[PDB]
Design a binder for this molecule. Structure first.
Ligand SMILES: O=C(O)[C@H](O)[C@@H](O)[C@H](O)[C@H](O)COP(=O)(O)O
Length: 248
């Protein structure tokens, strides 16, 4: 009955829904990442604001693939921007996504994951449209419910899900808040980062296992906070440096 238990039970139920409903899509996404690695392509992940947190969770990560890179749009990487409200305004700016993609090392055949719960703003929609125009394969992590219950804020009238090769449904109901209290007018307690981080790890774990099953040793990193982790990782980062853009 207490709020903590209600929230955690809501988050568990959402993870169960992802496990039971998105198993085949997670497999397809992990397979696309493994194909891209095998074929010599690069891997990138993007999200704006709090959707950036799931993208970051798979980059330079203990237990994660060394080959996953972050596509950084300045001002929308997490909520670090001053003022934080500028992050929200930048999600509406047409042309930011193309500036960032065109400057990046992404090329035809690469894979880009785009995390956007709503999928409705100009920046993630444009990011997907322009990435596909550049020949990238695009995986979206998005709550498809928003596409029927909200209006697109992109000029095209379309949502992120309309421009993805693979769509992973992150299930969160409109409002991104799992609890209500009779005395309290706004809902509270968002689970979207819990779910998207979990979805992202399921995808990259699938990619790692798929590489392994093909006789390809997955380039996995170890935690730098267990003795010996940084030495292990140094080997891996050097080995795959050509497709890694967060170090040299
Ligand atoms: O207001 C909210 O819903 C979040 O606090 C906000 O930071 C969100 O994470 C970004 O606006 C990106 O939203 P999308 O994930 O829908 O792209």
């Amino acid at each position: 009955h207490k709020p903590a238990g209600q929230f955690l039970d809501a988050a568990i139920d959402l993870l169960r829904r992802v496990r039971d409903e998105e198993a085949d899509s997670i497999e397809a996404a992990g397979t696309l990442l493994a194909d891209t690695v095998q074929n010599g392509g690069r891997l990138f992940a993007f999200g704006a604001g709090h959707s950036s947190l799931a993208a970051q969770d798979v980059v330079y990560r203990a237990g994660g693939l060394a080959l996953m890179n972050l596509l950084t749009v300045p001002g929308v990487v997490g909520i670090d921007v001053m003022p934080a409200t500028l992050g929200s305004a930048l999600e509406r700016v047409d042309g930011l996504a193309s500036a960032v993609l065109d400057s990046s090392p992404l090329r035809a055949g690469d894979a880009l994951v785009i995390i956007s719960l709503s999928g409705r703003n100009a920046l993630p929609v444009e990011m997907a449209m322009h990435a596909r125009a550049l020949g990238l394969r695009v995986i979206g992590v998005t709550s498809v419910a928003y596409a029927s219950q909200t209006t697109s804020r992109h000029a095209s009238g379309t949502f992120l899900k309309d421009h993805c090769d693979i769509v992973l449904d992150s299930k969160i109901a409109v409002g991104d808040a799992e609890l209500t209290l009779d005395t309290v007018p706004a809902p509270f307690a968002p689970a979207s980062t819990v779910v998207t981080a979990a979805l992202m790890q399921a995808v990259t774990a699938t990619a790692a296992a798929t590489l392994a099953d093909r006789g390809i040793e997955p380039p996995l990193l170890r935690s730098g906070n267990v003795d010996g982790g940084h030495e292990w990782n140094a080997r891996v980062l050097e080995q795959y440096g050509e497709r890694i853009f967060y170090r040299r």
